[PDB]
Amino acid sequence: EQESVKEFLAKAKEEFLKKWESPSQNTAQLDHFDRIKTLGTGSFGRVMLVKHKETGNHYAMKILDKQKVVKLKQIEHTLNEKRILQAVNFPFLVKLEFSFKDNSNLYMVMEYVPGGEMFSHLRRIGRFSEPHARFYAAQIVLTFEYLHSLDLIYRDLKPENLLIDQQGYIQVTDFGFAKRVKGRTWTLCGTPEYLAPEIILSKGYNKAVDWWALGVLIYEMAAGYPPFFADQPIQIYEKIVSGKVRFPSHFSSDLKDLLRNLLQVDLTKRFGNLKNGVNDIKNHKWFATTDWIAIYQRKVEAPFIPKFKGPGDTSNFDDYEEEEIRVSINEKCGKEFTEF
Numbered sequence: 550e551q552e553s554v555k556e557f558l559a560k561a562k563e564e565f566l567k568k569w570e571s572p573s574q575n576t577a578q579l580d581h582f583d584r585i586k587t588l589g590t591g592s593f594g595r596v597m598l599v600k601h602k603e604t605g606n607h608y609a610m611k612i613l614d615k616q617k618v619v620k621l622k623q624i625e626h627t628l629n630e631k632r633i634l635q636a637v638n639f640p641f642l643v644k645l646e647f648s649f650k651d652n653s654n655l656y657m658v659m660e661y662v663p664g665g666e667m668f669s670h671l672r673r674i675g676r677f678s679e680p681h682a683r684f685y686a687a688q689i690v691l692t693f694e695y696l697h698s699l700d701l702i703y704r705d706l707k708p709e710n711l712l713i714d715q716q717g718y719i720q721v722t723d724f725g726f727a728k729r730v731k732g733r734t735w736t737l738c739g740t741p742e743y744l745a746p747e748i749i750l751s752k753g754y755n756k757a758v759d760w761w762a763l764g765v766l767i768y769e770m771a772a773g774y775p776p777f778f779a780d781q782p783i784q785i786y787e788k789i790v791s792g793k794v795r796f797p798s799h800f801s802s803d804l805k806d807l808l809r810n811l812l813q814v815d816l817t818k819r820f821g822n823l824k825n826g827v828n829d830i831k832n833h834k835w836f837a838t839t840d841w842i843a844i845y846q847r848k849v850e851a852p853f854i855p856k857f858k859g860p861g862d863t864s865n866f867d868d869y870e871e872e873e874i875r876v877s878i879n880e881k882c883g884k885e886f887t888e889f
């Protein structure tokens with residue numbers, strides 16, 4: 550690796566650690582924003598488009614209900630998400646601008662990305678050509694090189710978590726499963742189609758699970774469907790652990806060779822987890838045309854520019870039932886969320 554890359558990552562780790570050791574807290578409040586529209590929902594949280602009343606800027610506000618977080622055993626995960634997001638800085642990660650809490654909820658206010666989720670675009674077009682998939686994959690490779698150098702495992706790669714910005718580049722969102730891990734970790738988490746075998750088999754696992762998930766993502770982008778597809782999770786898991794994958798005949802030979810090495814069941818043989826680390830991926834023939842520096846600098850013209858009218862346009866996101874943001878008169882779960 551060239552010294553310029555080594556020095557970049559050394560500085561990145563210094564800057565991350567300073568914010569990690571001393572996290573920001575309580576940098577806005579709810580009544581500074583107007584609520585516009587729900588952009589996504591989950592079992593313990595939602596994301597809403599909001600507008601800051603004084604500046605007029607738009608943001609995406611993630612709202613987590615403290616009592617639901619406790620019931621679903623996500624306390625440590627939500628504390629990880631905020632502490633990591635307030636400490637990272639990289640071109641292809643969503644930017645956390647504010648965070649705060651109140652009697653009922655936790656709030657993470659992120660920059661709004663108007664192009665929508667990669668998932669929508671992939672399903673609308675069918676599949677991406679190899680150059681188009683490779684443009685996105687290169688950004689994920691650089692983002693995982695950055696996160697892993699900070700001892701962070703991401704653990705939620707899937708097309709829904711990759712937002713497309715106004716220049717057609719990726720912003721990775723949802724750090725709800727991200728964790729700082731030196732060595733192994735054990736939690737069962739992630740979406741079924743993207744889980745590495747060692748997660749399914751309840752082993753201690755490491756950053757190699759993110760490189761497996763990259764293989765699933767590249768396959769899905771280039772084929773239009775994931776490699777271990779089946780109707781119910783137990784059937785998906787049986788396919789994941791089996792060591793077999795069928796490739797469409799339209800895949801290039803280089804793409805199939807890269808995917809055999811990312812979708813390697815034995816983690817000790819998986820690309821990204823060998824002696825040369827991420828460089829076995831960056832130097833693979835499928836990436837021969839990739840200018841890694843130009844991608845990082847956002848100098849490549851993107852394959853696809855989302856269609857939207859302005860920073861408040863939500864047309865690339867879909868419609869959800871609109872529910873109130875209720876805040877109890879009494880503090881809930883104060884002790885559990887003291888550090889947030």
Ligand SMILES: N[C@@H]1[C@@H](O)CO[C@@H]1CNC(=O)Nc1ccccc1
Nearest residue numbers: 589590591594595596609661662722
């Ligand atoms: N599954 C998660 C649940 O809390 C509901 O939606 C979450 C995922 N969605 C986003 O993070 N969306 C987004 C959109 C624009 C900018 C920043 C973020």
Ligand SMILES: N[C@@H]1[C@@H](O)CO[C@@H]1CNC(=O)Nc1ccccc1
Nearest residue numbers: 680681683684849850851852853854
């Ligand atoms: N297709 C674009 C559309 O906005 C109109 O013309 C633009 C031309 N640029 C590219 O396609 N760039 C690119 C870069 C990397 C990989 C694949 C493609």
